[PDB]
């Protein structure tokens, strides 16, 4: 019932490859429920051992789970039905009769991002075209997926193990120091759980994802980092401390280690752990990303 | 460092008298830090044993704490500087030199609510008049209180015991079934902690507040409840189950018991506990509100 939510969060600028560890964790743990509350994004990629690629902007990367029973798009979701239908059709095989795709009634339906989220907040009683409950009344494409709040809560209750997939990245948080060069929401576990309607006691663990060289999609960076519309930055220990403090991951996935010398990514493994420790976070780098595929995720304990 | 946040949340329509239990808990526990992220509201009232009244729309009711060291207005705060200054001046004595009032740099400054929250989300790089960091550059009134995100995190880190004061009420949640007849955000612990930038491991306990007869400030109600711009409703067990499920309070403050026969409020005590139990919530009604004052808060175990 409780402590059954593994929440994958990004500790930096949103391009740490959350999608990779989400897919990897889904395959390893076999979550019956996968959940997110994605707003429009460049996509989240997952590549399995067999080389099958999933580039999801809407659907959780966790849909690869062998025990997939429920696919849940949170209240905080801001999605294009077109994109959603495209992703469902592309994973048709994984989204069979025994897989329930639940769109939260209050998920924001994108017309044909900011204007959509704002229109939802406007709470215009006449506007029956912004939330999924309302759009589902004339758009049959989502009606089959759009559940009630009660059904949403009931789907979470009936979920054995849940993979929650946080969006963007911690430093892109609306209320982090880079404002207004940030996203429209906090990219913190508290906000993700809020946007997916996940009650706090359901949180099992936070899987924090990092890149050795964090990348920004023109935004502003941390003082202990420098540039190396993509802007590659050197690792920021301060970014990590801040991400550690707020996000408090239990486990860290350090990705794009393949782009650095052993000393390079190993130093960042140690830096992340120092940052975690410095911010009362028992987080340990457990997973290492050495490529975009399931096969490239290494247990940190096996490689260092 | 962690498990030091007592978060007072409202389980119904926002008029359960959260302010009363916040003030009561502040006096009993002596939190050095009191925190909220209030958007414009009708106010939160606290009356001490001596009869002193605090009607706060901006400041936490917890400022009454004998050990008050920090007063924190979260990133999610949407406040009038005028209202803030008025409340500070009225509690001047409680807000001495040894009390730091910290306004999150990303708190929304109300011009002279919806338009303010929206302007903040717009993230217009030219707009230096919406967030507290920016408004503090020309408005000295808040400059003295407006901290940096780092100082905000550092204030939470250095806090021994924190009273977090949730806003409005669970059924007023943006993503609860009453949408669009709801507030602009979820009124859930996850969202409150998100809006106050409180990392999830800092959560000690959730104090859920309820009224025997929930009141709506014209909105819609639960099917197991009926009406008895204020709309008084009979207790909704379904409302409680839903609030229990999401909010998962550890302790329940059942207020306005004074307006009901012993059997009336006692039945609701039992109903709340049944609702909690039915939704995997070990919540117990610990406090009973028999009036608007500190003296009127009773330990449930002492009266039934
Ligand atoms: N360690 C890695 N080395 C190289 N490419 C990788 C690695 N991890 C992921 N990728 C690729 O990097 C890109 C960005 O990752 P993606 O999942 O889309 O972003 P995010 O999940 O951070 O939003 C994808 O095309 C993905 O396949
Ligand atoms: N048990 C009670 N009986 C009578 N009046 C009460 C009781 N508890 C609180 N009040 C009063 O009810 C009003 C509403 O409470 P208030 O704290 O302002 O709302 P909330 O905290 O729910 O936003 C206040 O004027 C308060 O003094
Ligand atoms: Cl686990
Ligand atoms: Cl306690």
Tokens of B136: 């503090």
C-alpha distances in Å from residue A100, one per residue of A71, A73, A152, B29, B262: 6, 11, 11, 46, 46
**Using CB atoms, which residue from B121, B174, B179 is nearest to A184?**
B121
Q: CB–CB of B145/B101 below 8 Å?
A: yes
Is residue B39 within 8 A of residue B183, CB to CB? The reply is yes
Tokens matching residue A145? 């997926």
CA distance B173 to B192: 11
All residues at 6 or more sequence positions from B147 whose CB lies less than 8 Å from its CB, including other chains: B102, B103, B104, B105, B155
Q: Report the number of secondary-structure helices (H) and strands (E) in chain A.
A: 10, 15
CA dist B20 → A100, B49, B56, B255, B303 (Å) = 43, 11, 11, 9, 18
User: Best residue in A131, A179, A224, A278 to probe B by mutation, most B CBs within 10 Å?
Assistant: A179
CB-count exposure of residue B284 (10 Å: 0-12, 13-18, 19+)? middle
Of A15, A77, A80, A91, the catalytic one is A15
Q: How many CB atoms lie within 10 A of CB A172?
A: 24
Identify the domain containing residue B271 by its residue range. Answer: 2-304
Resolution reached, in Å?
2.0
Please list the residues that pair with B146 across neighbouring strands. B103
Query: If you measure from the C-alpha of residue B196 to the centroid of ligand 3, how many angstroms do you get, rounded to a whole number?
Result: 27
Structure determination method: X-ray
Identify whether A15 is a catalytic site residue: yes
Tokens of B38: 């209030």
CB atoms within 10 A of CB B259: 15
Calculate Rg over the CA atoms of chain A: 18
- Residues B34, B19: Cα–Cα separation, whole Å: 12
Total number of domains in chain B: 1
Q: How far is the CA of B60 from the centre of ligand 3 (A)?
A: 36
CA gap A166, A269 in Å, rounded: 22
Ligand 2: does its nearest atom lie under 6 Å from the Cβ of B48? Answer: no
Q: How far apart are CA B190 and CA B166, in angstroms?
A: 10
CB contact under 8 A, B245 and A75: no
C-alpha to C-alpha distance for A100 and B113, rounded to whole angstroms: 38
The answer to whether B214 and B180 are in contact (CB under 8 A) is no
Contact B271, B235 (CB under 8 A): yes
- Smallest CA-to-CA distance from A303 within A262, A253, A255 is with A262
**DSSP designation for B56:** E
How much distance in Å is there from the Cα of A26 to the middle of ligand 3? 12
3-state secondary structure labels for all residues of B62-105? HHHCCCCCEEEECCCCEECHHHHHHHHHHCCCCCCCCCEEEECC
Q: 3-state DSSP call for residue A53?
A: strand
Q: Please tell me chain A's helix, strand, coil percentages from 3-state DSSP, rounded to the nearest 5.
A: 35, 20, 45
State whether the beta carbon of A221 lies less than 6 angstroms from ligand 1.
no
* Cis-peptide into A180, omega within 30 deg: yes
Give the CA-trace dihedral at B91, B95, B97, B98, to 10 degrees: 150
Pocket test for ligand 1, best of A9, A15, A20, A24 (most atoms within 8 A of CB): A20
Q: Give the pairing of strands B44-47 and B53-56.
A: antiparallel
Cα–Cα distances in Å, from B85 out to B44, B69, B80, B125?
Answer: 16, 18, 9, 27
Cβ pair B17, B256 in contact under 8 A: yes
DSSP state of A243: H
**DSSP H/E element including A15:** none
Breaks in chain A (C–N > 2.5 Å) following residue: 112, 217, 228
Helix (H, G, I), strand (E, B) or coil at A227: strand
Feature table: binding site of A for ATP: 15-19, 43-45, 168, 255, 258, 291
Nearest to A277 by CA among A266, A269, A265: A269
How is residue A200 written in tokens?
């706090």
Quote the Cα angle for B294-B299-B303, to 5°: 115
Say which DSSP state B223 is in. Answer: T
Rounded to an integer, what distance in angstroms lies between the CA atom of residue B185 and that of residue B300?
31
Tokens encoding A159: 């979920």
Q: Which residues contact B144 (CB under 8 A, 6 or more apart)?
A: none
Q: Which residues pair with B210 in a beta bridge?
A: B254
Q: Which residue of chain B comes nearest to A282, CA vs CA?
A: B201
- Whether B260 and B213 have beta carbons less than 8 Å apart is answered as yes
What ranges in A18-110 are assigned the alpha helix state H?
18-29, 81-90
């Amino acid at each position: 019932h409780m402590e059954n939510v593994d929440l994958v969060i990004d500790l930096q600028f949103g391009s740490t490859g959350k999608g990779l560890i989400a897919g990897y964790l889904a395959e390893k743990n076999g979550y019956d429920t996968v959940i997110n509350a994605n707003m429009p994004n460049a996509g989240h990629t997952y590549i399995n051992a067999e080389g099958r690629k999933w580039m999801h902007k809407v659907l959780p990367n966790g849909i690869v789970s062998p025990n997939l029973k429920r696919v849940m798009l949170g209240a905080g979701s801001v999605f294009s039905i077109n994109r959603l239908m495209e992703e469902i059709e592309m994973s048709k095989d994984l989204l069979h009769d025994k897989v329930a795709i639940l769109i939260h009634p209050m998920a924001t339906v994108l017309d044909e991002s900011m204007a959509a989220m704002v229109e939802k907040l406007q709470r215009d009683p006449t506007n029956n075209t912004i939330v999924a409950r309302d759009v589902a009344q004339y758009d049959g494409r989502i009606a089959q997926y759009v559940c009630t709040v009660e059904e949403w809560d009931m789907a979470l209750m009936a979920s054995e193990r849940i993979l929650a997939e946080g969006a963007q990245g911690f430093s892109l948080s609306l209320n982090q120091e880079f404002y207004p060069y940030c996203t429209s929401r906090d990219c913190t576990p508290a906000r993700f759980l809020a946007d997916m309607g996940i009650p706090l006691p359901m949180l099992n663990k936070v899987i924090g994802t990092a890149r050795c060289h964090p990348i920004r999609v023109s935004g502003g960076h941390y003082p202990d980092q420098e540039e190396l519309v993509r802007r590659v930055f050197s690792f920021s220990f301060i970014q990590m401390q801040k991400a550690m403090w707020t996000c408090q991951p239990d486990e860290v996935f350090l990705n794009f280690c393949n782009y650095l010398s052993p000393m390079g990514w190993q130093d960042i493994v140690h830096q992340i752990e120092v940052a975690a420790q410095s911010r009362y976070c028992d987080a340990e780098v457990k997973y290492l990303g050495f490529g975009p595929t399931f096969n490239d995720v290494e247990l940190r304990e096996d490689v260092m």
